[PDB]
Structure formats: structure tokens, C-alpha cells
Amino acid sequence: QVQLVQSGVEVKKPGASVKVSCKASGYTFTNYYMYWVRQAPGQGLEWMGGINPSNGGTNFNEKFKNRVTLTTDSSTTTAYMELKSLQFDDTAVYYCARRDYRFDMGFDYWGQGTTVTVSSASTKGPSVFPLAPCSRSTSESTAALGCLVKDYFPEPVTVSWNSGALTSGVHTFPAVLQSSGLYSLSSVVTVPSSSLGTKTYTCNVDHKPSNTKVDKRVESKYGPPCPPCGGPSVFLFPPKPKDTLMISRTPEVTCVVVDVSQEDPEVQFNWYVDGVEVHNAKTKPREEQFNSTYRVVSVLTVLHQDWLNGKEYKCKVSNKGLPSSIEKTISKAKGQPREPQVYTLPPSQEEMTKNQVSLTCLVKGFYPSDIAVEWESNGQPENNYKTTPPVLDSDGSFFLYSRLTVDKSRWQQGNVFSCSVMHEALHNHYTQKSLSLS
Amino acid sequence: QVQLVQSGVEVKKPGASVKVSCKASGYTFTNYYMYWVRQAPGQGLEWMGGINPSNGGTNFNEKFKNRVTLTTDSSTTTAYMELKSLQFDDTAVYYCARRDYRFDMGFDYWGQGTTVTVSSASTKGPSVFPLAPCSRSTSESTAALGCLVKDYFPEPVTVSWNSGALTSGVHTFPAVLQSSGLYSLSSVVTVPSSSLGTKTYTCNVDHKPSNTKVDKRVESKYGPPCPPCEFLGGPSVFLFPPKPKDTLMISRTPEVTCVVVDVSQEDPEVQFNWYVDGVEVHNAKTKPREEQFNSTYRVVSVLTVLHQDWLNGKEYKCKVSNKGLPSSIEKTISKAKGQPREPQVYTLPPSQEEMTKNQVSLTCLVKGFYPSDIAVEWESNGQPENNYKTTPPVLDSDGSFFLYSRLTVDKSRWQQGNVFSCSVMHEALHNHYTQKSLSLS
Amino acid sequence: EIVLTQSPATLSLSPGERATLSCRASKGVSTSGYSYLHWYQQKPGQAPRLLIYLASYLESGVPARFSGSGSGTDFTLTISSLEPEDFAVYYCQHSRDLPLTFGGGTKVEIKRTVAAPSVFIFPPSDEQLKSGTASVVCLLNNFYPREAKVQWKVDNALQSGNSQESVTEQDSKDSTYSLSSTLTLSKADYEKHKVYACEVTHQGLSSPVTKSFNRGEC
Amino acid sequence: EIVLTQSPATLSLSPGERATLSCRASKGVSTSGYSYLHWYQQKPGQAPRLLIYLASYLESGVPARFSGSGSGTDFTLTISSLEPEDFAVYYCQHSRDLPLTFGGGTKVEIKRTVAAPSVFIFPPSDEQLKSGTASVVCLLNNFYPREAKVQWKVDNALQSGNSQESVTEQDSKDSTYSLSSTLTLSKADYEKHKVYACEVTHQGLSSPVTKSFNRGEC
């Protein structure tokens, strides 16, 4: 087979000389011309000259006459190209290519090329610097990392990731020749952002002309000595007591999910009334709550009788940041209802020396503890009142106190005050008791 | 510029010898006697001997006469103490000290001391382990880090931080002696939490007996190869009490001020949450965010004080959440010594309508108190009662708390004129105790 | 001295389509019954490969799909049906007179659906900053076509003549391009400013994408 | 030999107070107008420092707040206005006779207001876990008075016999102490348990302070 084997890589200073060889084999060497063509990096082809081996007759391109010497050895079927007085723009890949002497049928066989670099540098190994995001917290699933292989001479450098194991997503860019005359290239790799502190990322840079090998760790696993800098949770809220007891008002069960990831913002809600699935819940759109988390709410309306007869309201939440699914259930407090007793108490004699006095309402003997207490004056609602939470008594029932603060003059001028209680065990879920200066 | 420089740490076998050198400089070597004093572990100072460098005359403590040799080298202005036939109890710090030849004016200059250990046990270099927090939390303003220097023999080990550049907040602890006969020591440093990931932290450990010199990295920067986890370390929150400075009058209106800095331009949106005794409040004045100036943002929230809350000692908590970051930065302030509010106690007889029942309720209204921490009990004719219940404290409109306590009694007992008392225990009462009585009129 | 112009400089086609590359000579290259014009294929890192000689006759070992036509000054190299192995550079060469000259080349690239660039920005490493220089790197990943403009801005001020770009060859699997732009500054010049950003314009982007960072905030 | 009796053994005083240290020699140390009795100050980690020589002459460089007096057998060192940096052991020494001998020392401790410790817990390093031991460390930083208790709990089980503590000498500027406690376990035992707690009791803390970590969440 026809073969043209050229000599190796050349690195020269300007003003120096270079001699490239081209070993021919598998054909009658003397029946073909040998031509010389060069290609500067990222440029086209430039024919330099030609030699006829049988007689040594040379042809040249005007630009290369005087600086190029073409020679041949018919015993060793080798062609040589000596380029003298080298200049930076002689940097190229130099090719030999044969051509039939009798009938020109183009350059049918070429050598593999010989790279020649013309430069004032000075063999030097690279400084390898890591390429990493300044703040890869984000909501994006793919992160880029790399190695900047700067200030080396001459070419080439080879870059691998994780000793050959990491191949997908890698882009090693062609080298750039800087104003200094030293080369530089970057190698990058796109990886899943989840993997960052879970998996190791190392670039293996080899610069054979300087015998330098560098395995630069760009991203390590989490843990010391690195400075330090839990999935969705569900809350289910019952209706408001007044809303379950009054037929005018509307009771609702509210399901809220918090700590939802930015990469996984799912809104999958499933509701059940006494184990049977329902579909009348009005779900709301998701919102970013000043955390690196999403919050979303689903509201299921309930009939007054369903909540009062018990009934379990289950909220199932689904999201791709959970191993399974979160399910919370709510209902009215279980147990035999017991009826509240309501009593009003006037201010203490000792409190009458003050500008404002306390009107007291004792509400005792009720079960469950869901209750609403309010105050009214003459024929209108009051405002300056506070009610205590329900307290469990020794008989298994609850009591509470509600306190209305009033100007002593209002109490002293005979105004009638009313303490109103709404509870499920009361007739029409409502009762009222009056208080007046005796 | 008088200096006495002694030779380094020594460890020797019993029956062997040690030679301690003392290089003198900054004075006329021959005009001062050189003395040797030791300090054994758990002991005071012991005089060993002295030499006259001009003529070689010596004096010794009889306890060491026969084992100590004192010598001088005039050309190097050095004095030597050689202690032969070493005993386990010769373990000590050895010092040279000078004394004026013509007048006895004390041991005015001393060498730095040479630690000498006598032991047939083997010399062992330490293992150096970093001390770093298990995932540091907010809003801790101070962080601690350190180094555990474990399992070495003999003493001493020296420790420095960042090659002597870090000295403030450093505590190098005395060593502990383990049951194995090996020593351990801990060195720590406290730094601002804001500094972690800004500067590197490394302890430099030296154990001269085994020629161990370790530079252990405890904390790195933020900072490839460390994964990124937002940048800058995090925004900083500063919560100010009511003041400020300059002038009067009714404007004025004391305010608690929350100020946040180091808020980035890529994550500008900030939310402020205010709590008074852990109860969220909504009256705060969040000022519009400002760029001024370096590069970050500055957002200010002002909460007006109400009632007598600051003086009572209420806790003002400001929580800052930056849109784009995982956590929230919480800061809390309060007056150091708060002024409590005294409970007012009132007893109320049973409602007239409850008097138709077999059991009646005696009520105790307790109001106007701060702090909420209180206890109520009941008595009948002075005797502690059995069946009463008290509600939790309820926050009132004026910033104080109130509650009710209820005692159930048989109507017959109320009707037969027994005296019932409501008793209250609280910080703001005389003798932390008061009672109010109630009887059928 | 005869010169050769090739057209179009770049030809973007899908595997299966036809490729008609043109070559125009300043003077006539046909003499004595033959047209002294030849075609060559060049893959990256490989020597040129002879396809057609004397503008028409097929070279031994070359597939049937390659053919050449022409006389005088206008010459055409056809690729009846392209294959993945045909996406390469193609050169024309004359030899009716010395000096021998080549055309400027025609790159046959793979046609593909428009993909926007996934842009990333990297600050200078602490390790580099101790050396007195600062390299800020902007990456434009997996995009098509190759045309994309990168503008560097420092504190909203446009940068010029202190940058260098590098582009990959079209990716074998997905036929996409990736690009890197490095803004080099001294440590003194880098410490003087605070905000660094690279704005990216491309057919796939409805509005310029601008990835940025702040010097101190890292 | 002459025995030099120092008293009190310890002296705890606030800054600004006068400290009075006494030294009684068993035999007279005065001759021909001179009392051969000197005083030294020894601070943690340093050589003794001469304060007073020949009973009452102040050594150059020593502050004027130090003064000595006496003759024959009874001698006194006075620190007229104590400073925090005066924390040290003070020794008297004679040179009337051979052997030269020192008193047993008076330790001067500085009083300050109560300071609660700041507590920090440290898990064992992965580096230490490669060997077969686990060291858990607790730091009690900058507290006063000295008395402090540490209790170690491993999954709520009180530890005994496997802990050691070190207390620093009183600080020369702030007069506080610091304490480091180390719980030592075999790696096997460390890996069989989940929560590691350090509980601290001190006068400055109304209720004890507990610092914990869960192994595996580090």
C-alpha cells in the first residue's frame, strides 16, 4: 500500500531552521513528484514547492523561493523540506503529498502532517485553575464545572475527568494562543446539580513536553474542612367553631404544604371524607415564601352536619421530593357532648375603686371544647373582652371564663350586658345570659 | 538588651545525663554569677547551684552535690549545667539566672527554661485532629474551632494558629495525662461566625522530642473544591434598642430598630417578622430598601414600643428572610433587668343562678401581672384545698396578663360561712405571696 | 498567478440532502482536452483527501456519491446524498500553471433544530488571584447554529480587546456547538471593579441572556 | 537551712485592692545594713521575674505599685492597686546562707463578676475514626468563677470513667477561665449510638446548658 510517513513535532525559535522528512513506501518513488503543502491553524492550504526525485528538479511558490531547500534520497525513498529563517507565521502543519510525474491526477496520497511551532517561548507547564459557579444554590437541575489550563507551551495538553470515568457532558475547547505566546484552554463538564457535594469532580491535565501531570480537584464531597454555609411537611387546619355552629357561615378544612423544593414544585392534592375520595376541594396556586421553598394551599368546604356527626377529613399530598406520600387527618373531637352552663358575675367590690371594671362570664360543664363566646351591650356587640382557653375539669368536662372590661360609669348607670355562647350541645347551638347593676 | 537563651527540650533515660546550656548576651559575661534553679511538677523553686565565670568557683545545694557539674565557655559566653545519674524525679523545668557578682541584687534576668523529662518510656509524636462544628447554625454570632493533639510523650507540645498571625481568642489548654501514660492537649479559637469561609484556619503543632511539625487545616474558604451549597457568607442583622441620641420631645416615640446589611443585588427582596415575647406583631414600619452604596442593600424595619413593654423586660425578636436563601436570620433584644407588674387579686362569690345547684364555684380574678409566670392555690379556713383549676394567663390589651382560678365546693360548705382564700405566688409581690379571702356575707 | 474562489463558505444540510460546492478560477484552467482542477476532503486533524481529479474522474477508493463537473473557470463538486462521514471541509486546487493554489474551502455542516445556549459564568479562582492575573470565563453550551455574540460588561461598561473566544467542533451525537469566552484582567484592574457579566445573543434566545456575579460576593 | 514561710497560700482580690503577702524567715536574713531577701513573680508558662531585691529595692522596669518592706525575719510584699495582669504565684527568696532557698509561694487570684460559659460541642473527625477511637470534645469558654460541671450523655445514658478535663489558668486581661472536656470512646461504641450531649452547670447559668449533635448529621 502507498504510504507517506512524516517526521515528528518541531518547536523552533524565530530565525532558526527546520528539516522535515517524508518516508515514502509501497510505490515506485521516482515515478511521482513530491510536493510540500502547509496549513496554518484554522487557515487554508498553501502549496510551497515540489521536487522530481528522478532528477532533483525543483518548482516553488515565490513566497518560499530562497527560504526552502527541497531534497530527496532514492535509496531510502525519503523526501526532505528544509525551511530556513523561521518566522512566527511559519507555524503550521506541513504535509508531503505525491503527484504522478507523467499525467497530473492531483495529490492522491498525503503524509500525516508535521506540526511546526515558531516561538520565543520556552517550554512551560500549565497552571490549572478550577472553574465553578459562584453560588450554585439555584432552582436549576444542571450545573457546569471545569478547569482552566493556562500559560503552557508548547501544545498539546490532554484533559480527562475522573481518570476517564466521566465522559458524558465534557467539552474540551481548542487552545488559544495568548499575546504572551503561551497557550491556554478550558475543559468543562455539565453534571446534575444534586451530585455536587455527593460525587467528586477532578480534571487530569497532562502536558507531555514539560513532563507535567496535574489532577486538580475542582469539587469535593461535603464535610470538614469545608465551611458549613428537610423535605415537605403538611398541616391540616379544622374549621372555625362559629362556622360549624351557624348555618349562615361556611366551614372549611384547610390543607397547607410547606418546605416544598424549588426543583420539585408539585401541586398534587387528594381529599377523603370518611375514607371515600372527594373532588370538590378548591386548590390555590403555589407561592415562594421568602425561603428557598414553595407553599401551596387546598381548601375543602364541609357541610355543618358532617363535621358535627364526626367525619374524618383526610388530606393526601404528593410531590417528587418525597419517598412515599404525606397524609394528615382531622375531625371534630370525639366523645359524648355535654351542655355548657353559663353564669354571669358582677365586678368585685374591691375593683369598684378603679376607673374600669371587669364583667365576668363563667362557662362550665361543656364537651367537646369547641366553643365561641361573645359579649353584647343593650342591643349591640361589644369589643373590649378577652376569653380564656377551655380548661379540663376533674369531671371530664371543660370550663372557661370570658372577661368584658367596661368604664365603671357604664356599669353604674345600669347598662345591661350579655354573655352569648355558641356550642353544639346547646339548643339551636346558642344561649345568652344577662348582667346588670343590682 | 540582656538575654539568657537556653537549649531545647530534653528526654533522657534514668541513669543517663542531661546537659543544659545557657547562652548569655547583652552584658559582660564575667561580671555575673550564673545560677541554676529548677521547678519540678507540682512544686516550687529549687536552687541547684551557681558558678563564677571569672574564676570557675562554685557552690552547690548538698542534695545535688555529686551529680551536678557547672562549666563555662568564655569564648561563646555560655554556661552549662550537667546533671548526671538521672532519676525519674529529676523531671522538671530547669532555668539559668544571673546575679551581680559585686552586690547581691537578686536573680534579675532568667533564661526561658528547659523542660527535662526522665523516662525509660518511648518518645511518641502526636496525632493532630481538627475540631469543627457539626453543621453550624444561625443566628450564632461566635463560632469555635480547634485542634485535638492526641497521644504524645513526653511533654511539651507547642501550638499556634495561622503561623502566629491568629492570637486573639486562642486558648491552648494544659495537657491531660491519659491512663496509657501518654498526653493529649486541645487548642481552641473563637472567631466571628461571619469569618468562617472568608479566611483559612490552621493549627501549627510542634512536638520537638519526636521532630513532629504538623500544620492541620481545620476550616477552608467557600471556595472550590468546597461545594457552593447564595454568596457573601450571608446577610447580617443588627437589632437596636430604643434611644437614639441628640434631642427631645414627644417625637420621640421610642422604637426598636432592625437593620439588615450584606443583602445581595441578585436576591434583594427581604421580609421582616416581629415577635414581642414570641407573639407575632404587625404594627412595624418597614422602610423602602436602599442600594447605598458599596454594592449590597440596606433594609430598615422600625417597631414602636407599646405600653411599658421595654421596661417590663419584654423580648423583641426580629426575623429576617431573604428571598432566595434557605433559612431565616433571627435576633433578640430586651432590657437587662425588667420591671415586673404586680398582680391585682379579686374574689367573686357564686352567681345567684348557680346557688340552685349542689356545688358552687368560687372565682379568683388575677390581673395586671408581668411576667406571665404565676401560681394560684386555694385554702379553706387556711387549709390547702383539693379540687381547683386555673386557666392559663391571657395577654391583656395593656400588655399585662390576667387569669381566673375556680374552686368548686359543696354549697353547704359555702352556706355555713367557711372562709375560702385565693393565694398567688409571683415575682412582683411582697414576699412573693398574697392572699384574698371570700366568705358568705 | 491564478486564484480560486469557493462558494458558499459554509453549507448547512441534513444527512440525505445534496451538496453542490462551487469553485471559480480567475483564468481558464482547461488546456489540451483536460481541466486542471481537483477536489479534496479534509476532516479535523487529518490530511486532505483527494476525491476527484481533472474536475470529473473519480479517485480510486472514493464513494460513488461524490462527482465533479465543469470546464473553463466554473467547477462544481456534487455529493448526491450526504452521509455523516461527509460533513467536513472541501477544497478545490488548480494546476494549469505554477504556482499551484487552493480555494478557501467550503465547510459542510449538519442542519439541526435551533437550540438556545445554556449559559454559565465562572469567576477567577482564589489560586489564580494570588498570581496577579484574573480570568473570568463565560460558557455557551449545546447551541445551534455556530453564530452567537458574547459581550463582556464590567459595572455595565462594555469591554473590548481584552477577551478571547474558542469554539468546539459540531458534536457527533446531538450536532450541537459549545463556546467559551475568557475575559483576562490584571489583579489591580479586577480589584478596581465589582460586577462582572457576559451578555449572550443567539437565534434561539428571544431576549439576551446575561449571567453575572459580584467579586466580593462569592 | 533557712525556711521561708509564706502566707496566705492564696489570695483572691478585686482589681484596685491592695494585696499584702507575708514572708517569715526561720532565722534572721539581715547583716551590716542589708536584708538578703528578694521577691519574684511567676506567671503561667514563664520564668520567675524579680520584683524586689534586698527586701525593699524596686527592680528596674517593675511598676511602682509593687513594694517590699521588713527586716530580720518578717517581710512583706505589697501590691497597692491590683490589676488583672497581677494574677501569678509570688515567691520570696533569701541569700543570707547556703543553701539558697525559696518560700512556698502565694497565688494571687483576681475577682471579677460572674460570667456564664459559652458552650460548644465537637464531633470526632473522620480522620480519627480511621483509627479505632472516637474523641468527642466540649468547650466551656470564658467563664467566672472556676467551678463548673460537665456531664456527658450518649443516647441519654450518663457517662462515667471515660472523660478527662483541662482548665486554663486565669486570663491576664479578662480574668476568666475556659475548660475543655473530652469523652473518649471506641469507634465501635461511637457508631452504635446516635445523640452526643454535653451538659454544663455553672453559677452564671440559672438552668444548665446542653449542646448536642447526632452522629451522621455532620
Ligand SMILES: *[C@@H]1O[C@H](CO[C@@H]2O[C@@H](C)[C@@H](O)[C@@H](O)[C@@H]2O)[C@@H](O[C@@H]2O[C@H](CO)[C@@H](O[C@@H]3O[C@H](CO[C@H]4O[C@H](CO)[C@@H](O)[C@H](O)[C@@H]4O[C@@H]4O[C@H](CO)[C@@H](O)[C@H](O)[C@H]4NC(C)=O)[C@@H](O)[C@H](O[C@H]4O[C@H](CO)[C@@H](O)[C@H](O)[C@@H]4O)[C@@H]3O)[C@H](O)[C@H]2NC(C)=O)[C@H](O)[C@H]1NC(C)=O
Ligand atoms: C420557610 O417559610 C415557610 C413559610 O413561613 C412564612 O415565611 C417565612 C420565611 C417566615 O417569614 C415565616 O414567619 C412565615 O410564616 C415556613 O412555614 C412554616 O412551617 C412551620 C413548620 O416548621 C409551620 O408550623 C406549624 O404551624 C402550626 C400552626 O400554624 C398556624 O399558625 C401560625 C401562627 O401561629 C401561622 O403562621 C400559620 O399560617 C397557621 O395559621 C393558621 O392557618 C390556617 C389555614 O390558613 C387558618 O385556618 C388558621 O386560622 C390559622 N391560625 C392561626 C393561629 O393563625 C402548628 O400547629 C404546628 O405545630 C404542630 O406540629 C409541630 C410539628 O410539626 C409540633 O412540634 C407542635 O407541637 C404541633 O403539634 C407547626 O408549628 C408553619 O405553620 C409554617 N407557616 C406557614 C405560613 O404555613 C417553613 O417552615 C420555612 N422553612 C424553613 C426550612 O425554615
Ligand SMILES: OC[C@H]1O[C@@](CO)(O[C@H]2O[C@H](CO)[C@@H](O)[C@H](O)[C@H]2O)[C@@H](O)[C@@H]1O
Ligand atoms: O503563532 C504565531 C501566530 O499567532 C499570532 C496570532 O494568534 O499571534 C501570536 O504570535 C506570537 C506567538 O509567539 C506572539 O508574538 C503574539 O503576541 C501572539 O498573539 C500571530 O502573531 C501569528 O500569525
Ligand SMILES: OC[C@H]1O[C@@](CO)(O[C@H]2O[C@H](CO)[C@@H](O)[C@H](O)[C@H]2O)[C@@H](O)[C@@H]1O
Ligand atoms: O358532678 C356532677 C355534675 O356537677 C357539675 C356541675 O353541674 O360539675 C361540678 O362538680 C364536679 C365534681 O366535683 C366538678 O368537677 C365541676 O367543676 C363542678 O362544676 C357537672 O359538670 C357534673 O356532671
Ligand SMILES: OC[C@H]1O[C@@](CO)(O[C@H]2O[C@H](CO)[C@@H](O)[C@H](O)[C@H]2O)[C@@H](O)[C@@H]1O
Ligand atoms: O389548673 C390546674 C393546675 O394546672 C397548673 C399546672 O401546674 O397550671 C395552671 O395554673 C397555673 C397557675 O396556677 C397557670 O400558670 C397554668 O397556665 C395553668 O395551666 C396548676 O398551677 C393548676 O393548679
